[PDB]
Amino acid sequence: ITGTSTVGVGRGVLGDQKNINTTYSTYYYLQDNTRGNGIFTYDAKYRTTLPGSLWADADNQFFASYDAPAVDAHYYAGVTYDYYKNVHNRLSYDGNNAAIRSSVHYSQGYNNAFWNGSQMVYGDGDGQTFIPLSGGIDVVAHELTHAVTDYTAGLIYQNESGAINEAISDIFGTLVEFYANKNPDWEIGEDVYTPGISGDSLRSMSDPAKYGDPDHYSKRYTGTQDNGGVHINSGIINKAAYLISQGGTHYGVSVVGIGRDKLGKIFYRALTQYLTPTSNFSQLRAAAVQSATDLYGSTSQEVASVKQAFDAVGVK
Numbered sequence: 484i485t486g487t488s489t490v491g492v493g494r495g496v497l498g499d500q501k502n503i504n505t506t507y508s509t510y511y512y513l514q515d516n517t518r519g520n521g522i523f524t525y526d527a528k529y530r531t532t533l534p535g536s537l538w539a540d541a542d543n544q545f546f547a548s549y550d551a552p553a554v555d556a557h558y559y560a561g562v563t564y565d566y567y568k569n570v571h572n573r574l575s576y577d578g579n580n581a582a583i584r585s586s587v588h589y590s591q592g593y594n595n596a597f598w599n600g601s602q603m604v605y606g607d608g609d610g611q612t613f614i615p616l617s618g619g620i621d622v623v624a625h626e627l628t629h630a631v632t633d634y635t636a637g638l639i640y641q642n643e644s645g646a647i648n649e650a651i652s653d654i655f656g657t658l659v660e661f662y663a664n665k666n667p668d669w670e671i672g673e674d675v676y677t678p679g680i681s682g683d684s685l686r687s688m689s690d691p692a693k694y695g696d697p698d699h700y701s702k703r704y705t706g707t708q709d710n711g712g713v714h715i716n717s718g719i720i721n722k723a724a725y726l727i728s729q730g731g732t733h734y735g736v737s738v739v740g741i742g743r744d745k746l747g748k749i750f751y752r753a754l755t756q757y758l759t760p761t762s763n764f765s766q767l768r769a770a771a772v773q774s775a776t777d778l779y780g781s782t783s784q785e786v787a788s789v790k791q792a793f794d795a796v797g798v799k
Protein backbone atom coordinates (compact mmCIF):
# COMPACT_ATOMS: atom_id res chain seq x y z
CA ILE A 484 0.00 0.00 0.00
CA THR A 485 0.96 3.66 -0.35
CA GLY A 486 1.66 5.37 2.94
CA THR A 487 4.32 6.71 5.24
CA SER A 488 7.17 4.54 6.41
CA THR A 489 7.48 4.10 10.10
CA VAL A 490 8.77 1.77 12.76
CA GLY A 491 6.67 -0.51 14.91
CA VAL A 492 7.61 -2.79 17.74
CA GLY A 493 6.65 -6.32 18.50
CA ARG A 494 7.63 -9.63 19.97
CA GLY A 495 8.81 -12.57 17.91
CA VAL A 496 8.00 -16.23 18.25
CA LEU A 497 10.67 -16.73 20.89
CA GLY A 498 9.42 -13.80 22.98
CA ASP A 499 12.14 -11.37 21.93
CA GLN A 500 11.26 -7.75 21.26
CA LYS A 501 12.32 -6.15 18.02
CA ASN A 502 11.56 -3.16 15.88
CA ILE A 503 10.03 -3.74 12.49
CA ASN A 504 9.62 -1.46 9.52
CA THR A 505 6.00 -0.76 8.80
CA THR A 506 3.88 1.50 6.65
CA TYR A 507 1.09 3.72 7.87
CA SER A 508 -2.06 4.32 5.86
CA THR A 509 -5.04 4.29 8.22
CA TYR A 510 -3.63 0.99 9.43
CA TYR A 511 -0.01 0.07 10.08
CA TYR A 512 0.96 -2.59 7.60
CA LEU A 513 3.85 -5.02 7.74
CA GLN A 514 5.33 -3.37 4.71
CA ASP A 515 8.99 -2.41 4.91
CA ASN A 516 9.78 0.30 2.39
CA THR A 517 13.41 0.59 3.35
CA ARG A 518 14.62 -2.55 1.59
CA GLY A 519 14.39 -2.79 -2.16
CA ASN A 520 10.87 -2.69 -3.55
CA GLY A 521 9.57 -3.77 -0.20
CA ILE A 522 9.21 -6.55 2.31
CA PHE A 523 5.58 -7.49 2.70
CA THR A 524 4.17 -9.87 5.28
CA TYR A 525 0.71 -11.38 4.94
CA ASP A 526 -1.77 -13.14 7.19
CA ALA A 527 -2.95 -16.38 5.67
CA LYS A 528 -5.51 -16.72 8.49
CA TYR A 529 -4.99 -20.51 8.84
CA ARG A 530 -6.01 -21.14 5.25
CA THR A 531 -3.98 -22.46 2.38
CA THR A 532 -4.94 -19.68 -0.01
CA LEU A 533 -2.10 -17.29 -0.69
CA PRO A 534 -0.87 -14.75 0.05
CA GLY A 535 -3.78 -13.78 2.22
CA SER A 536 -4.19 -10.25 3.57
CA LEU A 537 -1.40 -7.75 3.90
CA TRP A 538 -0.82 -7.70 7.62
CA ALA A 539 -2.71 -4.73 9.08
CA ASP A 540 -2.37 -3.57 12.67
CA ALA A 541 -4.27 -0.76 14.37
CA ASP A 542 -1.55 0.61 16.64
CA ASN A 543 1.92 -0.35 15.22
CA GLN A 544 2.47 -2.62 18.23
CA PHE A 545 2.74 -6.34 17.58
CA PHE A 546 2.78 -8.07 20.97
CA ALA A 547 -0.14 -10.43 20.42
CA SER A 548 0.61 -14.12 20.25
CA TYR A 549 -1.04 -14.15 16.84
CA ASP A 550 1.39 -11.42 15.75
CA ALA A 551 4.60 -13.21 16.66
CA PRO A 552 5.18 -15.25 13.49
CA ALA A 553 4.52 -12.19 11.38
CA VAL A 554 6.97 -10.06 13.31
CA ASP A 555 9.74 -12.59 12.82
CA ALA A 556 8.94 -13.39 9.23
CA HIS A 557 9.01 -9.68 8.51
CA TYR A 558 12.09 -8.98 10.59
CA TYR A 559 14.19 -11.91 9.46
CA ALA A 560 13.30 -11.30 5.87
CA GLY A 561 14.85 -7.89 6.37
CA VAL A 562 17.96 -9.37 7.98
CA THR A 563 18.37 -11.82 5.13
CA TYR A 564 17.91 -9.01 2.64
CA ASP A 565 20.61 -7.12 4.49
CA TYR A 566 22.95 -10.09 4.48
CA TYR A 567 22.75 -10.55 0.73
CA LYS A 568 23.02 -6.83 0.07
CA ASN A 569 25.90 -6.11 2.42
CA VAL A 570 27.94 -9.27 2.08
CA HIS A 571 27.30 -10.32 -1.51
CA ASN A 572 26.19 -7.07 -3.13
CA ARG A 573 22.92 -8.70 -4.21
CA LEU A 574 19.68 -6.72 -4.21
CA SER A 575 16.94 -9.06 -3.03
CA TYR A 576 16.58 -12.54 -4.45
CA ASP A 577 16.45 -11.59 -8.14
CA GLY A 578 19.32 -9.09 -7.86
CA ASN A 579 16.96 -6.28 -8.87
CA ASN A 580 15.29 -5.60 -5.49
CA ALA A 581 12.21 -7.75 -6.04
CA ALA A 582 9.64 -7.40 -3.29
CA ILE A 583 9.92 -10.10 -0.67
CA ARG A 584 6.54 -11.46 0.37
CA SER A 585 5.87 -13.83 3.23
CA SER A 586 2.64 -15.35 4.49
CA VAL A 587 2.32 -16.64 8.03
CA HIS A 588 -0.41 -18.61 9.75
CA TYR A 589 -0.53 -20.87 6.76
CA SER A 590 -2.95 -23.75 7.21
CA GLN A 591 -3.48 -25.39 10.58
CA GLY A 592 -0.80 -27.28 12.42
CA TYR A 593 1.51 -27.05 9.43
CA ASN A 594 5.04 -28.19 10.27
CA ASN A 595 6.85 -26.68 7.36
CA ALA A 596 7.90 -23.50 5.68
CA PHE A 597 8.54 -23.08 2.00
CA TRP A 598 9.37 -20.80 -0.84
CA ASN A 599 6.63 -21.49 -3.37
CA GLY A 600 8.35 -19.79 -6.29
CA SER A 601 6.72 -16.40 -5.60
CA GLN A 602 6.80 -15.97 -1.83
CA MET A 603 7.68 -17.49 1.47
CA VAL A 604 5.07 -19.44 3.42
CA TYR A 605 5.36 -20.33 7.11
CA GLY A 606 3.24 -22.77 9.02
CA ASP A 607 2.60 -22.33 12.72
CA GLY A 608 3.69 -25.86 13.49
CA ASP A 609 1.62 -28.23 15.58
CA GLY A 610 3.17 -26.98 18.81
CA GLN A 611 5.06 -30.20 19.47
CA THR A 612 7.23 -30.85 16.42
CA PHE A 613 7.49 -27.17 15.55
CA ILE A 614 6.44 -23.77 16.76
CA PRO A 615 5.86 -21.11 14.10
CA LEU A 616 8.63 -21.64 11.65
CA SER A 617 9.41 -18.02 11.02
CA GLY A 618 10.92 -17.82 14.49
CA GLY A 619 14.04 -19.46 13.17
CA ILE A 620 16.31 -17.10 11.35
CA ASP A 621 18.01 -20.01 9.68
CA VAL A 622 14.59 -21.21 8.48
CA VAL A 623 13.68 -17.82 7.03
CA ALA A 624 17.07 -17.48 5.42
CA HIS A 625 16.88 -21.07 4.21
CA GLU A 626 13.64 -20.36 2.38
CA LEU A 627 14.69 -16.97 1.08
CA THR A 628 17.85 -18.54 -0.22
CA HIS A 629 15.72 -20.89 -2.33
CA ALA A 630 14.50 -17.74 -4.04
CA VAL A 631 18.13 -16.74 -4.74
CA THR A 632 18.95 -20.20 -5.98
CA ASP A 633 15.85 -20.46 -8.12
CA TYR A 634 16.65 -17.11 -9.71
CA THR A 635 20.32 -17.99 -10.27
CA ALA A 636 21.50 -21.61 -10.59
CA GLY A 637 17.92 -22.89 -10.85
CA LEU A 638 18.77 -26.22 -9.27
CA ILE A 639 15.82 -28.52 -9.82
CA TYR A 640 14.31 -29.94 -6.64
CA GLN A 641 15.20 -33.55 -7.40
CA ASN A 642 18.06 -35.95 -6.72
CA GLU A 643 21.52 -34.45 -6.33
CA SER A 644 20.64 -31.07 -7.76
CA GLY A 645 17.82 -30.76 -5.25
CA ALA A 646 20.13 -31.78 -2.44
CA ILE A 647 22.52 -29.05 -3.53
CA ASN A 648 19.59 -26.63 -3.56
CA GLU A 649 18.63 -27.64 -0.04
CA ALA A 650 22.26 -27.61 1.15
CA ILE A 651 22.78 -24.11 -0.25
CA SER A 652 19.74 -22.94 1.71
CA ASP A 653 21.09 -24.55 4.89
CA ILE A 654 24.53 -23.07 4.27
CA PHE A 655 23.28 -19.56 3.70
CA GLY A 656 20.59 -20.00 6.33
CA THR A 657 23.44 -20.67 8.70
CA LEU A 658 25.60 -17.87 7.35
CA VAL A 659 22.72 -15.49 7.92
CA GLU A 660 22.25 -16.84 11.42
CA PHE A 661 25.94 -16.02 12.01
CA TYR A 662 25.59 -12.65 10.32
CA ALA A 663 22.77 -11.75 12.71
CA ASN A 664 24.87 -13.19 15.55
CA LYS A 665 21.76 -14.75 17.01
CA ASN A 666 23.00 -17.79 18.94
CA PRO A 667 24.69 -19.02 15.76
CA ASP A 668 25.38 -22.66 15.20
CA TRP A 669 25.76 -25.21 12.41
CA GLU A 670 22.39 -26.73 13.18
CA ILE A 671 19.20 -26.10 11.20
CA GLY A 672 15.95 -25.14 12.82
CA GLU A 673 16.99 -25.53 16.43
CA ASP A 674 15.01 -22.45 17.47
CA VAL A 675 11.62 -23.75 16.28
CA TYR A 676 12.02 -27.51 16.40
CA THR A 677 10.64 -29.67 19.21
CA PRO A 678 10.07 -27.05 21.88
CA GLY A 679 9.86 -29.93 24.36
CA ILE A 680 13.39 -31.18 23.63
CA SER A 681 16.42 -29.00 24.15
CA GLY A 682 19.59 -29.36 22.17
CA ASP A 683 18.21 -30.97 19.01
CA SER A 684 17.48 -29.62 15.56
CA LEU A 685 16.02 -30.69 12.28
CA ARG A 686 19.36 -31.14 10.55
CA SER A 687 22.98 -30.81 11.59
CA MET A 688 25.64 -29.47 9.27
CA SER A 689 28.41 -30.27 11.75
CA ASP A 690 27.33 -33.89 12.14
CA PRO A 691 24.48 -34.72 9.79
CA ALA A 692 24.55 -38.37 10.91
CA LYS A 693 23.34 -37.14 14.32
CA TYR A 694 19.87 -37.36 12.78
CA GLY A 695 20.59 -40.19 10.34
CA ASP A 696 21.49 -38.01 7.42
CA PRO A 697 24.48 -39.00 5.29
CA ASP A 698 27.83 -37.39 5.91
CA HIS A 699 29.63 -39.24 3.15
CA TYR A 700 28.76 -39.83 -0.45
CA SER A 701 28.94 -43.61 0.08
CA LYS A 702 25.99 -43.22 2.45
CA ARG A 703 23.84 -41.22 0.09
CA TYR A 704 20.19 -42.09 -0.26
CA THR A 705 19.31 -43.53 -3.66
CA GLY A 706 15.56 -44.08 -3.28
CA THR A 707 12.62 -41.96 -4.30
CA GLN A 708 11.32 -40.57 -1.03
CA ASP A 709 11.78 -36.86 -0.53
CA ASN A 710 12.22 -36.17 -4.27
CA GLY A 711 15.19 -38.47 -4.25
CA GLY A 712 16.47 -37.42 -0.85
CA VAL A 713 16.82 -33.71 -1.38
CA HIS A 714 16.63 -32.96 2.35
CA ILE A 715 18.56 -36.11 3.17
CA ASN A 716 21.56 -36.05 0.88
CA SER A 717 22.02 -32.37 1.54
CA GLY A 718 23.88 -33.52 4.64
CA ILE A 719 26.81 -34.59 2.47
CA ILE A 720 27.18 -31.05 1.15
CA ASN A 721 26.43 -29.45 4.50
CA LYS A 722 29.26 -31.45 6.02
CA ALA A 723 31.62 -30.38 3.27
CA ALA A 724 30.65 -26.75 3.80
CA TYR A 725 31.07 -27.13 7.53
CA LEU A 726 34.52 -28.61 6.96
CA ILE A 727 35.55 -25.83 4.56
CA SER A 728 34.57 -23.27 7.15
CA GLN A 729 35.57 -24.91 10.39
CA GLY A 730 38.04 -27.56 9.37
CA GLY A 731 38.38 -30.98 10.84
CA THR A 732 39.18 -34.56 10.10
CA HIS A 733 36.40 -36.64 8.66
CA TYR A 734 36.75 -40.27 7.58
CA GLY A 735 40.48 -39.80 7.96
CA VAL A 736 40.75 -36.75 5.66
CA SER A 737 41.92 -33.54 7.30
CA VAL A 738 40.58 -30.14 6.25
CA VAL A 739 42.06 -26.81 7.25
CA GLY A 740 39.13 -24.48 7.80
CA ILE A 741 39.11 -21.13 6.00
CA GLY A 742 36.25 -19.51 7.88
CA ARG A 743 32.64 -18.59 7.26
CA ASP A 744 33.27 -15.46 5.23
CA LYS A 745 35.29 -17.29 2.58
CA LEU A 746 32.90 -20.25 2.63
CA GLY A 747 30.10 -17.83 1.84
CA LYS A 748 32.03 -16.08 -0.89
CA ILE A 749 33.01 -19.36 -2.51
CA PHE A 750 29.52 -20.86 -2.44
CA TYR A 751 27.86 -17.64 -3.51
CA ARG A 752 30.16 -17.43 -6.50
CA ALA A 753 29.62 -21.10 -7.28
CA LEU A 754 25.87 -20.57 -7.01
CA THR A 755 25.61 -17.48 -9.17
CA GLN A 756 28.38 -18.12 -11.68
CA TYR A 757 28.86 -21.84 -12.16
CA LEU A 758 25.99 -24.01 -11.02
CA THR A 759 23.15 -24.96 -13.34
CA PRO A 760 19.72 -26.50 -12.88
CA THR A 761 21.02 -30.06 -13.18
CA SER A 762 24.37 -29.76 -11.44
CA ASN A 763 25.28 -32.74 -9.32
CA PHE A 764 27.64 -33.09 -6.36
CA SER A 765 30.67 -33.63 -8.55
CA GLN A 766 29.84 -30.49 -10.47
CA LEU A 767 29.36 -28.64 -7.26
CA ARG A 768 32.87 -29.70 -6.30
CA ALA A 769 34.23 -28.33 -9.58
CA ALA A 770 32.20 -25.15 -9.19
CA ALA A 771 33.45 -24.60 -5.65
CA VAL A 772 37.04 -25.33 -6.67
CA GLN A 773 36.79 -22.92 -9.59
CA SER A 774 35.20 -20.22 -7.41
CA ALA A 775 37.95 -20.50 -4.82
CA THR A 776 40.48 -20.42 -7.66
CA ASP A 777 38.78 -17.30 -9.02
CA LEU A 778 38.84 -15.53 -5.67
CA TYR A 779 42.07 -16.76 -4.05
CA GLY A 780 44.28 -18.39 -6.68
CA SER A 781 44.92 -21.94 -7.81
CA THR A 782 47.68 -22.56 -5.24
CA SER A 783 45.81 -20.97 -2.38
CA GLN A 784 44.98 -22.64 0.91
CA GLU A 785 41.35 -21.89 0.13
CA VAL A 786 41.38 -24.04 -2.98
CA ALA A 787 43.18 -26.77 -1.05
CA SER A 788 40.61 -26.77 1.73
CA VAL A 789 37.69 -26.94 -0.71
CA LYS A 790 39.33 -29.96 -2.32
CA GLN A 791 40.02 -31.57 1.03
CA ALA A 792 36.44 -31.05 2.22
CA PHE A 793 34.90 -32.69 -0.80
CA ASP A 794 37.48 -35.47 -0.56
CA ALA A 795 36.44 -35.98 3.06
CA VAL A 796 32.77 -36.48 2.12
CA GLY A 797 33.61 -38.65 -0.83
CA VAL A 798 32.61 -36.25 -3.58
CA LYS A 799 35.06 -36.61 -6.41
Ligand SMILES: N[C@@H](CCCC[NH3+])C(=O)O
Pocket residue numbers: 594595596685714
Ligand atom coordinates in the same frame (compact mmCIF):
# COMPACT_ATOMS: atom_id res chain seq x y z
N1 LIG B 1 11.68 -28.79 5.14
C1 LIG B 1 11.96 -30.23 5.21
C2 LIG B 1 11.97 -30.69 6.65
C3 LIG B 1 10.77 -30.23 7.43
C4 LIG B 1 9.97 -31.41 7.84
C5 LIG B 1 8.75 -30.95 8.51
N2 LIG B 1 7.83 -32.08 8.65
C6 LIG B 1 10.97 -31.06 4.41
O1 LIG B 1 10.05 -30.52 3.81
O2 LIG B 1 11.07 -32.29 4.36
Ligand SMILES: [Ca+2]
Pocket residue numbers: 540541542543544545546
Ligand atom coordinates in the same frame (compact mmCIF):
# COMPACT_ATOMS: atom_id res chain seq x y z
CA1 LIG C 1 -1.30 -4.12 17.42
Ligand SMILES: [Ca+2]
Pocket residue numbers: 660665666667668673674
Ligand atom coordinates in the same frame (compact mmCIF):
# COMPACT_ATOMS: atom_id res chain seq x y z
CA1 LIG D 1 21.14 -20.94 16.53
Ligand SMILES: [Ca+2]
Pocket residue numbers: 621657660667668669670671672673
Ligand atom coordinates in the same frame (compact mmCIF):
# COMPACT_ATOMS: atom_id res chain seq x y z
CA1 LIG E 1 20.84 -22.74 13.31
Ligand SMILES: [Ca+2]
Pocket residue numbers: 673675676677678679680681682683684
Ligand atom coordinates in the same frame (compact mmCIF):
# COMPACT_ATOMS: atom_id res chain seq x y z
CA1 LIG F 1 14.01 -28.75 20.21
Ligand SMILES: [Zn+2]
Pocket residue numbers: 625626629648649652
Ligand atom coordinates in the same frame (compact mmCIF):
# COMPACT_ATOMS: atom_id res chain seq x y z
ZN1 LIG G 1 14.64 -26.06 1.51
